[PDB]
Scaffold this active site. Structure first.
Site, short mmCIF file in Angstrom:
data_model
loop_
_atom_site.label_atom_id
_atom_site.label_comp_id
_atom_site.label_asym_id
_atom_site.label_seq_id
_atom_site.Cartn_x
_atom_site.Cartn_y
_atom_site.Cartn_z
N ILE A 30 84.77 24.50 -40.13
CA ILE A 30 85.59 23.33 -40.34
C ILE A 30 86.18 23.45 -41.76
O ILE A 30 85.49 23.89 -42.67
CB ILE A 30 84.75 22.03 -40.14
CG1 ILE A 30 84.21 21.93 -38.69
CG2 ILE A 30 85.60 20.82 -40.46
CD1 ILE A 30 83.04 21.05 -38.48
N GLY A 31 87.43 23.06 -41.90
CA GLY A 31 88.13 23.00 -43.18
C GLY A 31 88.29 24.27 -43.97
O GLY A 31 87.97 24.29 -45.16
N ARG A 32 88.76 25.34 -43.30
CA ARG A 32 89.10 26.65 -43.87
C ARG A 32 88.17 27.19 -45.01
O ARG A 32 88.64 27.80 -45.97
CB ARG A 32 90.57 26.58 -44.36
CG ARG A 32 91.59 26.23 -43.27
CD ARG A 32 92.81 25.56 -43.86
NE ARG A 32 93.72 25.05 -42.82
CZ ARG A 32 93.66 23.83 -42.30
NH1 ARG A 32 92.74 22.97 -42.71
NH2 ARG A 32 94.53 23.46 -41.37
N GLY A 33 86.86 26.96 -44.88
CA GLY A 33 85.85 27.41 -45.85
C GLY A 33 85.64 26.55 -47.09
O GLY A 33 84.67 26.78 -47.82
N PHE A 35 84.38 23.74 -47.65
CA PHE A 35 83.12 22.99 -47.64
C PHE A 35 81.93 23.91 -47.39
O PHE A 35 80.83 23.45 -47.06
CB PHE A 35 83.17 21.90 -46.55
CG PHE A 35 84.26 20.87 -46.69
CD1 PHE A 35 84.01 19.65 -47.30
CD2 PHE A 35 85.53 21.09 -46.17
CE1 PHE A 35 85.01 18.68 -47.41
CE2 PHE A 35 86.53 20.13 -46.29
CZ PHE A 35 86.26 18.93 -46.91
N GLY A 36 82.14 25.21 -47.57
CA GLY A 36 81.10 26.21 -47.34
C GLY A 36 80.92 26.49 -45.87
O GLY A 36 81.88 26.39 -45.10
N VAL A 38 80.22 25.27 -42.82
CA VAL A 38 80.22 24.08 -41.97
C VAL A 38 80.94 24.50 -40.68
O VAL A 38 82.07 24.99 -40.73
CB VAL A 38 80.87 22.83 -42.65
CG1 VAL A 38 80.61 21.57 -41.83
CG2 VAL A 38 80.35 22.65 -44.07
N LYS A 56 76.04 22.10 -40.93
CA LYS A 56 75.92 22.89 -42.16
C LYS A 56 74.60 23.66 -42.20
O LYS A 56 73.53 23.05 -42.11
CB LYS A 56 76.04 22.02 -43.43
CG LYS A 56 76.01 22.86 -44.71
CD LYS A 56 76.00 22.00 -45.96
CE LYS A 56 76.10 22.80 -47.24
NZ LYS A 56 76.19 21.91 -48.42
N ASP A 147 78.27 10.52 -58.27
CA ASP A 147 79.49 11.34 -58.20
C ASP A 147 80.53 10.75 -57.24
O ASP A 147 80.98 11.42 -56.30
CB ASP A 147 79.15 12.83 -57.87
CG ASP A 147 80.21 13.87 -58.21
OD1 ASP A 147 81.32 13.47 -58.68
OD2 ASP A 147 79.94 15.07 -58.02
N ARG A 151 87.63 12.54 -53.48
CA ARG A 151 87.33 13.84 -52.87
C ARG A 151 86.00 13.78 -52.12
O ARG A 151 85.79 14.57 -51.21
CB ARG A 151 87.32 14.98 -53.92
CG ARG A 151 86.02 15.12 -54.72
CD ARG A 151 86.11 15.99 -55.96
NE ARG A 151 85.10 15.59 -56.95
CZ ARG A 151 85.35 14.82 -58.01
NH1 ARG A 151 86.59 14.41 -58.27
NH2 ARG A 151 84.36 14.48 -58.83
N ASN A 152 85.12 12.84 -52.51
CA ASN A 152 83.78 12.70 -51.96
C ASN A 152 83.65 11.65 -50.87
O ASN A 152 82.55 11.40 -50.37
CB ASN A 152 82.80 12.49 -53.10
CG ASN A 152 82.69 13.70 -53.99
OD1 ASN A 152 82.71 14.84 -53.51
ND2 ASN A 152 82.57 13.51 -55.30
N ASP A 165 78.84 12.84 -49.83
CA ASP A 165 78.40 13.62 -50.99
C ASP A 165 77.10 13.06 -51.63
O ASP A 165 76.99 12.93 -52.86
CB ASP A 165 79.56 13.78 -52.01
CG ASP A 165 79.27 14.62 -53.22
OD1 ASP A 165 78.85 15.79 -53.05
OD2 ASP A 165 79.45 14.11 -54.35
F1 SW5 Z 1 76.59 19.02 -46.50
C1 SW5 Z 1 77.86 18.72 -46.11
C2 SW5 Z 1 78.44 19.46 -45.11
C3 SW5 Z 1 79.74 19.14 -44.73
C4 SW5 Z 1 80.43 18.10 -45.33
C5 SW5 Z 1 81.84 17.75 -44.92
C6 SW5 Z 1 82.02 17.22 -43.52
C7 SW5 Z 1 81.10 16.58 -42.73
N1 SW5 Z 1 81.66 16.26 -41.52
C8 SW5 Z 1 82.95 16.69 -41.51
N2 SW5 Z 1 83.82 16.55 -40.50
C9 SW5 Z 1 85.04 17.07 -40.73
C10 SW5 Z 1 85.43 17.70 -41.92
C11 SW5 Z 1 86.81 18.23 -42.10
C12 SW5 Z 1 87.32 19.10 -43.08
N3 SW5 Z 1 88.61 19.34 -42.92
N4 SW5 Z 1 88.95 18.61 -41.83
C13 SW5 Z 1 90.35 18.57 -41.28
C14 SW5 Z 1 91.33 17.87 -42.21
C15 SW5 Z 1 92.69 17.74 -41.54
N5 SW5 Z 1 93.20 19.07 -41.13
C16 SW5 Z 1 92.27 19.75 -40.20
C17 SW5 Z 1 90.90 19.92 -40.83
C18 SW5 Z 1 87.91 17.93 -41.32
C19 SW5 Z 1 84.50 17.81 -42.95
C20 SW5 Z 1 83.22 17.30 -42.74
C21 SW5 Z 1 79.79 17.38 -46.34
C22 SW5 Z 1 78.50 17.68 -46.73
#
Ligand code: SW5
Length: 277
Positions: A30-33, A35-36, A38, A56, A147, A151-152, A165
């Protein structure tokens, strides 16, 4: 696994997801890396209904000692449920997994910054009231975020803001390789965090929302922030920000923590400003 204390094993069962209840697709992040590690997941409830979730892998944890602490992190965060707070669906015990709900619109700062989306002044204040609500819930449980920033915070399919976060959702942005501008003046001077410093940070988040995600203090270095605020200088009123809401932001940045509003007073004030649209 059998090395774990059985009393603790028993106490963590209500947070544990069975392997047969979860489908993790390790082939799609999810989210092109950003967020690590995920991954897209599918959690099955007792009725067999499918819940789209974000899984995660916790690579840092490698021994029974660190595993035990993580079980306690899951136990505490499982009791934190509110519509404006990111929930812990569960934990999976191959490194341990943290199962979070899926947020279609990702993080709040990126959503408001994306030129394709055109939120109104009402939608923005509505996001701020939502954060204030989650923060009011966290402050009621004596939980200090430390924090808070746009962004969080996350956004789901119904555009419901979720304060994230924290707990097992901490270190959200750990992209492996091959926040003084939100901090209260006393946090900067003593390295100690309270609900009162979370309120200063909320005031910054409010300013971020009203500027559509502009970075605070662009011409002030992070070392120069302490002197700048001591001179009584603050973030200026954003362009399309109403005077009552800017009065709220300034109250959030008062040099005396005890003079700052509580999250309850901020929910009260912001909801009544929100109602005027
Ligand atoms: F330990 C952690 C682990 C993970 C998180 C983040 C997280 C949790 N649930 C999420 N669900 C969706 C997305 C996400 C990211 N990008 N996107 C879209 C944006 C719009 N474009 C497509 C892609 C959706 C992020 C999260 C936090 C803490």
């Amino acid at each position: 696994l059998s090395a774990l204390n059985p009393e603790l094993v028993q106490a963590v069962q209500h947070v544990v997801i069975g392997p047969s209840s979860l489908i993790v697709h390790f082939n799609e992040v999810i989210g092109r890396g950003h967020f690590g590690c995920v991954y897209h997941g599918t959690l099955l409830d007792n009725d067999g209904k499918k819940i789209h979730c974000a899984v995660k892998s916790l690579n840092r944890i490698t021994d029974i000692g660190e595993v035990s602490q993580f079980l306690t992190e899951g136990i505490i965060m499982k009791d934190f449920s509110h519509p404006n707070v990111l929930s812990l669906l569960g934990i999976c015990l191959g490194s341990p997994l943290v199962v979070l709900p899926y947020m279609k619109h990702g993080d709040l700062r990126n959503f408001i910054r994306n030129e394709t989306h055109n939120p109104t002044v009402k939608d923005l204040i509505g996001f701020g009231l939502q954060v204030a609500k989650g923060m009011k819930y966290l402050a009621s449980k004596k939980f200090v975020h430390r924090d808070l920033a746009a962004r969080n915070c996350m956004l789901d399919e119904k555009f419901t803001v979720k304060v994230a976060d924290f707990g097992l959702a901490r270190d959200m942005y750990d992209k492996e390789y091959y926040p003084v501008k939100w901090m209260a003046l006393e946090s900067l001077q003593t390295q100690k965090f309270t609900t009162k410093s979370d309120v200063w940070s909320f005031g910054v988040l409010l300013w971020e929302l009203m500027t559509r995600g502009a970075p605070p203090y662009p011409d002030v270095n992070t070392f120069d922030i302490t002197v700048y605020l001591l001179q009584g200088r603050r973030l200026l009123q954003p362009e399309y920000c109403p005077d009552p809401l800017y009065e709220v932001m300034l109250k959030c940045w008062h040099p005396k923590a005890e003079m700052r509003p509580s999250f309850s007073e901020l929910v009260s004030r912001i909801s009544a400003i929100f109602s005027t649209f």
